[PDB]
Design a protein around this nucleic acid. Structure first.
Lengths: 492, 50, 105
RNA sequence: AGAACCUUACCUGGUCUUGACAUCCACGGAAGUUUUCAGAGAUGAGAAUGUGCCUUCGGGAACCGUGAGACAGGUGCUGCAUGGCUGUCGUCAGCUCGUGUUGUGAAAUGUUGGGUUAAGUCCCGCAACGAGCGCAACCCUUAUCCUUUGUUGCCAGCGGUCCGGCCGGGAACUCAAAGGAGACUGCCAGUGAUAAACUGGAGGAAGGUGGGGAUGACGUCAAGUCAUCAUGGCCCUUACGACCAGGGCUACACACGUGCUACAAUGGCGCAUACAAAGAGAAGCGACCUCGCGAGAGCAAGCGGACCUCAUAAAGUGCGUCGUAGUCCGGAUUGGAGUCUGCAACUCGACUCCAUGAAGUCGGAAUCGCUAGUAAUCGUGGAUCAGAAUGCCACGGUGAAUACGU
């Protein structure tokens, strides 16, 4: 009876490596819940188990409140202070009630709550154990295969999950199969799987190379980037600080043995290993392997690169369904446009002609002078407006007065273009003029300006009938806005 | 289990007999209980309904 | 930090602190660094000739403030100058540490 | 860790060979047990009596004989063809490896040096940084104490006492058997590079690994064993195999190794009396009483064991006594009469009684053991074993000197 509580607490504490305190708190909550179910009224109940005897007292409790909404769980401050003058709002008044007899009903409830706490703490221990192994390749046995996930057994009551997106597209696992994967996330969820394992993400490739290539595990070779199309093709970029070591040769190994071991573990995925370069253009040339690059043009402002290839290499540079260019773009972080040498020249000629047409139209210069600006590398009105005066003065035939005039024209052309778009839509001109009438939101101002009503005067000249087709404008609201516009324009 | 063994402390029963099952009755007929007789062999404790 | 004095006997408790202490003052300040280094900033290349020659076997670029009695042949980016006094180190180390700080952005 | 026969592998000689011993096959015979015997015995010639189980009763199993063989057998040679096992340098502190590094390289470095220690034992320094076999520590016994239990072990306080722990009775004690406490340079002081560590002091049963023991690093002698056994060859197989009786291993001008007993007076003999530990015990240890000068014998308690027995310890002491002698020293050898073991004591057992009485009077050149409960000295037990120690292995009694120092 008494000594039996101690023997049960000791047996459970030793077998489940769990704090005795956490088991008692849970038994108290279990007994309180079992007690609540014997009363027809919703009562609040506290149970306290004596830690030496195993005896337990059951208390009905009331929350001390100002206004009682639930007479079964709440007591007024005036009534609480009649029993104990020390009580405040938010304290509990407690009456000792008859403790529920420990029948097989309470016994079953206690067993369920113990099993739940054992699971909660086994789960906390698994999270704490595997948190240090986040990013590493773990090995599990397939316990269950569902449509949307695979449950892995890692041993020691640890379960992991591979989601459908985290699998390779051609993998078929059976219960009892051994599977390797990277533990990429540990989640302390109260329900579900806590350990998330991937075979599809780039981290799986990096860690397979770390295991297969000692020089990566010894930090002699660094993997700088990895891009992956899971179960089809990957690219890895490798660097070394030791000039005596070829990083590509080390990752390939004798006759490709190392890269073939990684490829075999990934279901026959093709792996390209490229040298990392600190020059972006040289790194993209390396990333485009096995296609030979003829020239690269870098657009730093758009973060894009145009890659010219020989017409025979175009299909190899793009790859099957664009796979080669996409993996190179993901590996470099640059947007990569693959074209022929002839197409690149045609693109540059079209851009130069468009820049010449833009400069001739907006700067009131001749085509010969516009051509000189494009040959000196100016392509936009913004460059001409904002570039340091020294760079414009390095151009043969530009004097300080002509550069100042060119910049003033470029700024005025930019202002004109901005004002034109601001009157075409509702950016600034119609967002102030047409939107002067009280009630005009920015959307309505742009809808008005799309009909050619750009100013508060243009709106004052309209009829209700001219505006009736504008979505969100009722005849009454149209009439109010036209009258507000007329009051400002004609009577202000 | 340890929790079923804890019945010895508060309830007092050693092991709640040995098994657990309440003689429940079968189906096929409705009705309304109109009369209950309880006969007691002499010496046995009469319960509260007897 | 959590133990080695209560997990076991007191004889190994005092002893294993010496295994910690002798390893800390000579290695402990490099502990959280995985992989080969990239630039060794050296205070003297004369009595630390074994230091500068160890990187050239691995191709690491070396930086050393050498004196007149030192050997410039070992280091790649040679910095001449007095380095024996205590005052010269105050100018030296504080300046070069900021050069790594602008690189950490 | 013990040769009278056996052992036993050797010699003289008497015998036997598919056999001293094993597996397999053929036919008969159960097996077994008792007796007469040829002869030294072996083996062989026999003579009675028994003839059990499974029943597939036209045959198996258990077992003996006869026959053919394939073989069995060998302590026969080779330890330098070998395994295993073991001895020794030495319980000395040393022997190496990984990777880096220096040199063309063999290799070196680490393991070197300053200190210190029983100790590459730690500490510091160092182109080295770690790792392993060792050292140490962990294990066993002994050193004090607490706790549990209390017999066949014990008797402090308690009653009866054939006054014997013998009997009630007691549970602290000795003792006993289990588990822990405890000694770790832990504490102090000086010294020492704030190092390691050393030299004193404190407390403590024990103090610098408390004492002892087991434990024996790579390898060295191409050390020892073919004879424990295992085993490649090689070889014999009417034989170097096998069986029996007797002998020899114990023989004897002589030298060496290791011990025992002594050469005496801190000694010998007689009388009285004190104090152990450990171990052994069933075709075995043997009380007690009795015949016996003695070795032992008869009857026979108890005990297949803290109880019973071997088993009444010796010097020690108290006293008497001899009186520096080859003698109440020493007792070899020798004659006679016997005791038990065992079929058997002659070659060739031990022991005992009576008699006998040697050399020897502290040892030359040279050489050995031992640093503490040791040397030395005294007595006991045990394995071996039918019987047969002064040896070997264990036990406890008594109890030293000296260690300037390299």
């Amino acid at each position: 009876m008494n000594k039996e509580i101690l023997a049960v607490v000791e047996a459970v504490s030793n077998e489940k490596a769990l704090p005795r305190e956490k088991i008692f708190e849970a038994l108290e909550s279990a007994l309180a819940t079992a007690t609540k179910k014997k009363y027809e009224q919703e009562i609040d109940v506290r149970v306290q188990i004596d830690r030496k005897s195993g005896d337990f007292d059951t208390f009905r409790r009331w929350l001390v409140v100002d206004e009682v909404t639930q007479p079964t769980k709440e007591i007024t401050l005036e009534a609480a202070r009649y029993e104990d003058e020390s009580l405040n709002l938010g304290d509990y008044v407690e009456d000792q009630i008859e403790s529920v007899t420990f029948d097989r009903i309470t016994t079953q409830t206690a067993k369920q709550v113990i099993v739940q706490k054992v699971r909660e703490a086994e789960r906390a221990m698994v999270v704490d154990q595997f948190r240090e192994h986040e990013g590493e390749i773990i090995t599990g046995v397939v316990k269950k295969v569902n449509r949307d996930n695979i449950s892995l057994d890692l041993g020691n009551n640890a379960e992991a999950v591979i989601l459908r997106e985290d699998m390779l597209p051609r993998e078929n696992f059976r219960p009892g199969d051994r599977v390797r994967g990277v533990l990429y996330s540990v989640r302390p969820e109260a329900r579900g799987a806590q350990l998330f394992v991937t075979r599809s993400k780039p981290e799986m490739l990096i860690e397979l190379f770390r295991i297969e290539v000692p020089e990566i595990g010894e930090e002699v070779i660094e993997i700088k980037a990895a891009a992956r199309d899971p179960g089809s093709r990957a690219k890895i970029a490798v660097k070394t600080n030791d000039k005596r070591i070829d990083p590509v040769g080390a990752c390939v190994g004798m006759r490709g043995a190392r890269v073939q071991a990684v490829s075999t573990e990934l279901g026959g995925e093709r792996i390209d290993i490229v040298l990392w370069d600190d020059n972006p253009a040289q790194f993209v040339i390396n990333a485009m392997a096995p296609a030979d690059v003829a020239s690269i043009v870098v657009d730093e402002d758009k973060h894009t690169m145009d890659i010219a290839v020989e017409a025979g290499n175009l299909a190899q540079a793009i790859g099957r369904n664009g796979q080669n260019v996409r993996l190179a773009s993901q590996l470099s972080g640059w947007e990569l446009n693959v074209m022929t040498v002839d197409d690149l020249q045609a693109k540059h000629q079209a851009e130069a002609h468009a820049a010449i047409d833009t400069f001739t139209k907006y700067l009131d210069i001749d085509e010969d002078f516009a051509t000189v600006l494009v040959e000196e590398g100016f392509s936009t009105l913004e460059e001409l407006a904002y570039v340091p005066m020294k760079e414009l003065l390095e151009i043969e035939g530009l004097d300080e007065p002509t550069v100042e005039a060119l910049r003033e024209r470029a700024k005025n052309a930019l202002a004109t273009i901005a004002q034109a778009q601001e009157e075409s839509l509702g950016d600034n001109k119609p967002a102030d003029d047409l939107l002067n009438l009280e009630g005009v939101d920015r959307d309505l101002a742009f809808k008005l300006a799309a009909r050619g009503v750009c100013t508060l005067e243009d709106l004052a000249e309209q009829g209700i009938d001219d505006l009736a087709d504008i979505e969100g404008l009722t005849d009454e609201k149209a009439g109010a806005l036209i009258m507000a516009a007329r009051n400002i324009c004609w009577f202000g | 289990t340890p929790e079923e063994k804890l019945l010895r402390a508060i309830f007092g029963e050693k092991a709640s007999d040995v098994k657990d099952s309440s003689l429940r009755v079968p189906n096929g007929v409705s009705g309304t209980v109109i009369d209950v007789q309880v006969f007691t062999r002499d010496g046995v404790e009469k319960d509260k309904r007897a | 930090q959590d133990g080695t004095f209560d997990k076991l006997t007191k004889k190994e408790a005092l002893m294993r602190t010496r295994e910690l202490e002798k390893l800390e003052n000579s290695l402990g300040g490099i502990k959280d660094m995985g992989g080969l280094p990239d630039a060794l900033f050296v205070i003297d290349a004369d009595h630390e000739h074994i230091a500068i020659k160890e990187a050239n076997n691995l191709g690491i670029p070396v930086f050393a403030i050498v004196d007149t009695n030192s050997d410039p042949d070992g280091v790649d980016f040679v910095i001449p100058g007095n380095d024996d006094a205590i005052r010269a180190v105050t100018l030296y180390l504080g300046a070069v540490a900021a050069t790594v700080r602008e690189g950490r952005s």
